[PDB]
Design a protein around this motif. Sequence first.
Motif, PDB file in Angstrom:
ATOM      1  N   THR H 143      27.690  35.720  36.974  1.00  0.00           N
ATOM      2  CA  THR H 143      27.745  36.377  38.436  1.00  0.00           C
ATOM      3  C   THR H 143      29.546  36.437  38.569  1.00  0.00           C
ATOM      4  O   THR H 143      29.948  37.399  39.444  1.00  0.00           O
ATOM      5  N   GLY H 144      30.379  35.843  38.104  1.00  0.00           N
ATOM      6  CA  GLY H 144      31.957  36.095  38.255  1.00  0.00           C
ATOM      7  C   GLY H 144      32.155  37.523  37.724  1.00  0.00           C
ATOM      8  O   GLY H 144      33.004  38.263  38.621  1.00  0.00           O
ATOM      9  N   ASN H 204      42.139  31.146  28.876  1.00  0.00           N
ATOM     10  CA  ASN H 204      42.011  29.712  28.696  1.00  0.00           C
ATOM     11  C   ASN H 204      42.684  28.890  27.644  1.00  0.00           C
ATOM     12  O   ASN H 204      43.134  28.017  27.921  1.00  0.00           O
TER      13      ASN H 204
END
Lengths: 51, 50, 104, 50, 54, 39, 431, 431, 437
Positions: H143-144, H204
């Motif tokens: 979804t991102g 990250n």
Amino acid sequence: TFWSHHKEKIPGVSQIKTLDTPFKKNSAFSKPIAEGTDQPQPYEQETHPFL
Amino acid sequence: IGPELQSDLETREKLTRPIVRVFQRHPGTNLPEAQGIIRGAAGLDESLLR
Amino acid sequence: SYQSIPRFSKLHPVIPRRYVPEWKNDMKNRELLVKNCEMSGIIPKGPHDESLFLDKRERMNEVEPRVRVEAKHPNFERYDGLRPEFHTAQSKYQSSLMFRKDNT
Amino acid sequence: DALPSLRDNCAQQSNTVVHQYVRECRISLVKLRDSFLETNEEVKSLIRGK
Amino acid sequence: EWDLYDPEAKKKDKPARVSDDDPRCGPSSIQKFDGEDLGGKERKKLMEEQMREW
Amino acid sequence: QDKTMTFGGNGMGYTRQVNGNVAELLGTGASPPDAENRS
Amino acid sequence: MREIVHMQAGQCGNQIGAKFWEVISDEHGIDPTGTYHGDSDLQLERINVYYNEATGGKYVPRAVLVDLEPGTMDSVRSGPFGQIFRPDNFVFGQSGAGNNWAKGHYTEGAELVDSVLDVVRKEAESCDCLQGFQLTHSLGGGTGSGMGTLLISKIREEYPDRIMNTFSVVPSPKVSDTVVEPYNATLSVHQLVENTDETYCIDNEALYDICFRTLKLTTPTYGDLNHLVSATMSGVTTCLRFPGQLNADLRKLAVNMVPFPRLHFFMPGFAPLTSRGSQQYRALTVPELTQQMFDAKNMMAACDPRHGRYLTVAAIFRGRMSMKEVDEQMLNVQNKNSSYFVEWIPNNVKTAVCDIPPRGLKMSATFIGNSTAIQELFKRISEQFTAMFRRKAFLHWYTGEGMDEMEFTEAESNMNDLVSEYQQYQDATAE
Amino acid sequence: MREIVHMQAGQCGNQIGAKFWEVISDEHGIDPTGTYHGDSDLQLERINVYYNEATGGKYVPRAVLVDLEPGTMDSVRSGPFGQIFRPDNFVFGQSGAGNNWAKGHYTEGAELVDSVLDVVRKEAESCDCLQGFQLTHSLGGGTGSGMGTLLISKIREEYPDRIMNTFSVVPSPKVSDTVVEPYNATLSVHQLVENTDETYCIDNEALYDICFRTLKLTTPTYGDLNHLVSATMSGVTTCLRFPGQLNADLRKLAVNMVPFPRLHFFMPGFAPLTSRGSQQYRALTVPELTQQMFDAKNMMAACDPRHGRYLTVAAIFRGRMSMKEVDEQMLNVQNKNSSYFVEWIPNNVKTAVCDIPPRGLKMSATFIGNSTAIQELFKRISEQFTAMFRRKAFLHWYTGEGMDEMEFTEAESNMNDLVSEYQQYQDATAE
Amino acid sequence: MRECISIHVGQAGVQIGNACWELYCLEHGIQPDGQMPSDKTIGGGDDSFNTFFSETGAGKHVPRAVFVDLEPTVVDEVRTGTYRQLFHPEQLITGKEDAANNYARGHYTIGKEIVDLVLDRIRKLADQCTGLQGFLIFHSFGGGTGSGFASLLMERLSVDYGKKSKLEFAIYPAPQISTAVVEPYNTILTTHTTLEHSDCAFMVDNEAIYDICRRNLDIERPTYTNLNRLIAQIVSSITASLRFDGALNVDLTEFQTNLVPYPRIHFPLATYAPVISAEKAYHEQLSVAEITNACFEPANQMVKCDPRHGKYMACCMLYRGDVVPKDVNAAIATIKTKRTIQFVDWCPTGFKVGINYQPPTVVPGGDLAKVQRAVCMLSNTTAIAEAWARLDHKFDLMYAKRAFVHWYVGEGMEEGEFSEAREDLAALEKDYEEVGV
Ligand SMILES: Nc1nc2c(ncn2[C@@H]2O[C@H](COP(=O)(O)OP(=O)(O)OP(=O)(O)O)[C@@H](O)[C@H]2O)c(=O)[nH]1
Ligand SMILES: Nc1nc2c(ncn2[C@@H]2O[C@H](COP(=O)(O)OP(=O)(O)O)[C@@H](O)[C@H]2O)c(=O)[nH]1
Ligand SMILES: Nc1nc2c(ncn2[C@@H]2O[C@H](COP(=O)(O)OP(=O)(O)O)[C@@H](O)[C@H]2O)c(=O)[nH]1
Ligand SMILES: [Mg+2]
């Protein structure tokens, strides 16, 4: 019942002069005057034996 | 014939998926999406009867 | 003053109830879309019969003639449909597609 | 008799033709867009001349 | 005219209803509806008890 | 590559492919020398 | 002292009217007995608009309840605020309707209309100014559609100079609840467009959607539906009962909203409508009321405002507020979404401001929209009508109660060309 | 009165945005129930940038919360600072696409996108002179990436001139969290390039090793990574939210950073950063802040800036601090590492000195680099993409969903075009 | 003022009427003595019993029913049973000689001598009535009193009363279960008065009720009392709108108007969903969606015909209890989007729904679980023609070599009746096919 608990807020409910269940139809208001038995109209007092 | 309910038909299989909708945003258009499935279903039904 | 007499196709339970294409109903570019239909001359601009899917069928009546709706074929053949390529989702029907042989 | 992949096959037929239509519309849109910028630059030049 | 036109007058007003038993909201405020099942969970417990015992 | 059964491509386009399909379905084709070098 | 006679037909119309008199009795501080128990004199000045004086300080509503099924008459007499009404204007029949427009129109429904018109005439010449007639019913049953249209035709034949506004609950196809509702709706839209000069069509699916998104409302039932309908019923006539900065009555709204005579089907709305969880996150401002008026999901007629062009928009505000803020908001909406507005009418908004809010809220708002998106429900009714008229289904009832198929053809043709008139005025150049 | 609308999409997006709203709340004095309990007057002055005022002392945030699964939605609502968000700004689907750009973009999200645009248009309408939109999307997921870039495209059609910044939680080649994140990244940063005014891309593993080495701290989990990203997002707009000595908002940052329209990919950096053991043994000075900014290990991306030329470098300083030290430190940096700066852009460092420091500290600095060494991130992503796409692995989940291989090939081609343009400006000479 | 007259003809009709009046008396609180121990009503404020009972000056409430049967057995059992003090002595009319499972004997010889008396009793009941909704005629197609005498009585009622609703509840023969031999002949002969004199004829099938009691109620060995109690539950759910307050009230005229498309098509299937047993009700939700889907499941139908091989012309759902219109509309939407339920093309609508508040009452020592929610579906569909196809297949292979015709000819009827009735049922089957297509 949903209708039993929100009774007196339900749209169609007629003249609850009955204590075991309220949805028994009280048609005392309609009662055209050829078979009317002087039933208590929904905004007046009852008769001797009040019941 | 599809699944037995339209709820579990999934967005990549309904005939009006957003791809089809942004195509139908312009006039004319009219994908031949359902007539072929109707004809195939009729042919398969006749095959079942035979 | 003319006759409408709508005509619908056979029922199919993939048709999603009532569906209207949004080109008939786009109120941001309608002055271009409707005049495009006029200049084409085969697409009717009429107010009724917008739902080409009404209940579960298709509208065979005046929402585009059968010409130009039956002509959108991307060169599909059964010869290439019976042998799907491995990397697509249609290759999981190979357990039933090889049961059909191939003539035409 | 019809293949048991008619629905998926027709859906991806529709996907392919929608894709071709939207690439051609993208070509038309970028042509209209660079014409629009040429018109805007010419309008700016005419305003300065005024 | 300042009474509503004060810039900080938005810090002085209750929202519309505050709580579930607010006296000012009624049938004409069109915010105290009879459709919210406030006693819905208790009613569901009573129905479950009745069905189980029956 | 392996066909992929896409639409017209390498020229003509959506409108010309649809018009060719209309001509093929209704009867004879439009003309042989139409769309010289796909313009 | 302009004043309105209210009439209510069928079970749906009777329940809506009962909720309406409940709401506008709370707005005037009137108990179900009939006495005035309010605090300010503003609730007492224009109490004659809807209530008639009795002996003592009793206020009897100027309402006529009509139905062919006595069960709903008993229900609305014995329900909440059932004591306020006069037993004499409870004219009914003991037959029923059977969801039959023919039975409600050309049969015993026309037996009752003599006493019905006698009651309405008594209330009408019990007046001094008589602003107009306001009817509520539904186009889904027999007494709601047939008898209601019969009263519409007779009252317009009697007084063709009064503002006749009817509301009518139109049938939605994804609510169903009746199989002959396209017949009942088509046979009544003809009488609505030809006689009534103000109609505020209300849809049950739109009401359910409003309850399920803007109000959560885990079990709304028919109470909340009539409650919202009563909100929009009071918000269109608030300026007759209370003074304000910019007054506008029913005649002014009809003048400023209806461009052509058969162009009068509206799209009502109300604001604010806030859920309990979002109660504390919301500050009541005039731009917020303007947005909730001009939100698509807030509509009460199942149309989508984006799916059409507005012709005229009446905006009736209530509460203390700023005329500049109101005017800039109602100009800013026109400047922003100008594509959803006809360009051959400059200033597509009529604006009214009343400075008496409802009990409770400090501000409130009311939307009325003569949108051209009202044609889609008529098209849905027409396509269901031709779907069940293609095979002559359910016509034996109507032919038994005395109708021919030519009346159905007239109804279909009138609905079709009315929708075509909407489309032609919708797709019109500026000049 | 410039306003920014915040948007979070995906699990990572919602978590990052929740931490961001936490730091904004306790930087502006907003408590968990949403009421100003601050000490300084310079905290409620410019609060309309991120907060819509409500009734009472309530200050709701101007954020849009997007997911296709309600688990992260319920987690954000149940966690701290979860009652501040308006319940209307919780738009979520029910199915959940899940590691699928096709399922997040072409379907599922493609019908929720109408309601999300309704909410985003709502927040944009409830503003005066809107600065623009920031998104915290999470490239490599579901979804991102897909639905997030769909939102970017739709709000770019809606509002073309307002500043679009995304925060771009781009995947890693050696973390290896998802097997289709090269597909999602390659297919989604293609949408980012043509649509965003500016992206502050954060990986990250650089967050991992800044926590492991600069902070030590032995337990960052996701909370401290979100704290670092959140501190950077507050630092890129502290000059807009607070009065300063040399103001620079997002538009000024974009103008002074990007020389070309597709060179808007930035390496962020926050550089007051020390462990608990080295906290008191580390002097806090302006040269120390600049030294920690211009360090390869402090970068919030995987791209080592030593092999690559800086194009434009921004330093947003916070605190009461001396312009002479600031300017002398940037001049000293430009004089020392002159080989890492492009010759054809003289004085390519921008100052933005604010006044209010972040809570707890006394000075801080935010680094925004536009080095040409950022091309190697896309190089590794395209290498993984062309390793997978040669054998057409995991492609049925997209093609049967509704896409085609031509879109994948053109996305790879424009990825190579962006990499080649960065290489061209890395190898470009002066004359 | 709303009232109905219940005419129970035949042994099946009389037994079904016994169960129905037991349920009616339990529902309205009338004890089997005939007196109402009201004990909770305030004054004479109870008008719910008016539609079925007539309160007299002795405190008794005589029912508005007429029990007729040609053999004295079951009627004398009613006179010797508990409801002796509740039924009027002249309402329970009986004969002497049985109808011998013979349509001719029930219609031409024995049915012609008490038809005047039952018509006189019906005339007295209707004159006592003043707001008569219609006549509920309970009988069997098995033959004898329930075929011939019922046909003659329905013909006479249609001649004299005319514009009055006549709802028929007919026991229909099973596809393969049967208890008689000449009942194909009897059914073929009685198709006419249920075709040209009836107004809404609900067929019920003994195999279907047996399968319902075996699968849902867990009754391995059921008798007719359970079947008659289920039919009583259905007719009570039909008539509940005339005697109980409800959100949407569906009277008999409104029910017929919203059900039957054409005067010839008036044979709807009937389905009742509360159906689960008492011990198995502990494990099921029994919500609105569940009870709506149980009606359209092709195993709770009470005619042995599969409705998937047919098209639903219309459906009249009568919800009873704590059923809200939002859940009603959600269930309607799910049913409409379901592939299996296929509606006819000339009916985009097709769901007349009526919500009643008063939940159903459970008989002491019953089999149905006491629940809060109930639905009664009355669906007009094209799938009922399978039963007629099986019926006239049986009739054709019986009537090939003229079996049993000598009894009918001896009791008076001609042989052309069989041919006329066979051709009329063939016309009805072709009519249903033409409507469905
Ligand atoms: N459901 C149900 N069906 C019954 C009952 N009693 C009889 N039947 C049916 O009735 C059919 C036979 O017709 P009967 O009712 O026995 O005969 P009749 O209608 O009284 O007419 P006669 O033969 O003259 O007595 C059988 O096939 C049974 O299915 C009953 O109590 N319940
Ligand atoms: N909004 C609303 N609709 C109602 C209400 N009562 C009934 N209806 C609708 O009215 C339709 C039936 O109309 P009906 O009441 O039978 O009209 P009548 O026969 O003239 O009394 C149904 O489809 C219901 O959805 C109500 O209280 N509110
Ligand atoms: N920095 C950071 N990264 C996260 C966080 N949560 C998840 N991620 C990363 O996001 C990626 C998955 O993206 P996801 O949120 O599932 O996208 P979605 O499927 O659209 O919801 C994983 O590779 C994680 O490394 C977080 O709190 N902080
Ligand atoms: Mg017998």
